[PDB]
Design a protein around this ligand. Sequence first.
Ligand SMILES: [Sm+3]
Ligand SMILES: [Sm+3]
Ligand SMILES: [Sm+3]
Ligand SMILES: [Sm+3]
Lengths: 166, 166
Amino acid sequence: QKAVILDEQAIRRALTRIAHEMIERNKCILVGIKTRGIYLAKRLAERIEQIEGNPVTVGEIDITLYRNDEPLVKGADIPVDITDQKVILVDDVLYTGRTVRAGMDALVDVGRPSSIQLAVLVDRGHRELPIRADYIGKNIPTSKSEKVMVQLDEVDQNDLVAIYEN
Amino acid sequence: QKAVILDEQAIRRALTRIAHEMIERNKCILVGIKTRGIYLAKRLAERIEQIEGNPVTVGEIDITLYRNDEPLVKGADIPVDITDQKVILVDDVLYTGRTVRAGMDALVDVGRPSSIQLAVLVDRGHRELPIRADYIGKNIPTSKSEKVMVQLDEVDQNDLVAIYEN
Ligand SMILES: [Sm+3]
Ligand SMILES: [Sm+3]
Ligand SMILES: [Sm+3]
Ligand SMILES: [Sm+3]
């Protein structure tokens, strides 16, 4: 048993809305966290380029969770200097915030960004840290037992966001 | 030229409201950051004990800012284990969020808290990180040039929160 919250079209509209919001708020480098966060950052960069006309750099931080979910940073690949620049971390599902914390720490170690923002496709609540997203595709109230999973063509061969019961 | 936003009585009411909110949300260890954040944590612990009847532990993280304000952690003194516990960082004025980030990092290094919340006397906006407070005494919209300063009896011999122009 699962419930589809966002289909492919809903994901597309959310990503397009986020791209527009980013453009409006910032007149920037996108850095994905988690496997799907990285694919989402690449989609957002493509949307921003199609809207604004100029290239958007995409980097990634490679992070893995472990059960205090202590996520470890394996490595980071950001192809340009982030010092004095605005970086927007891109996440698929904002939950406890522990992966985002790890990503922020990785960024402040590789450079001195002027600011770090956070864009997420879904925010399911239940933060365990004082972390909030600046851009959100869809807020989804969830119980602590439910799981939220994003499927993307690049990894799962389909685009969908679904909620599952314990 | 300065404008008083909160007088002693307003600070007292804010701290009392925050204590009540903490009690309601959490049925916990308070850790102050910044000189005034530490004094505020001690006041909150006293209010919670007077409301609930049980002692509240107070710790502190010693952090200093430097102009990417890179705040450095000099040391931390938390008198009890924070592993598997809820810790609430206490800050005087939430601004860029860079001091809070440093405090969270210090905490996850000394233990494995189940969660970290953030209580602030004032939130003046202008975050440079995806950080949000869970408890706020007063929100104060400010321009980027204005400064917000909290005075406490323990440090400044008077209780007041004031805004100053560039
Ligand atoms: Sm539909
Ligand atoms: Sm597709
Ligand atoms: Sm008055
Ligand atoms: Sm007083």
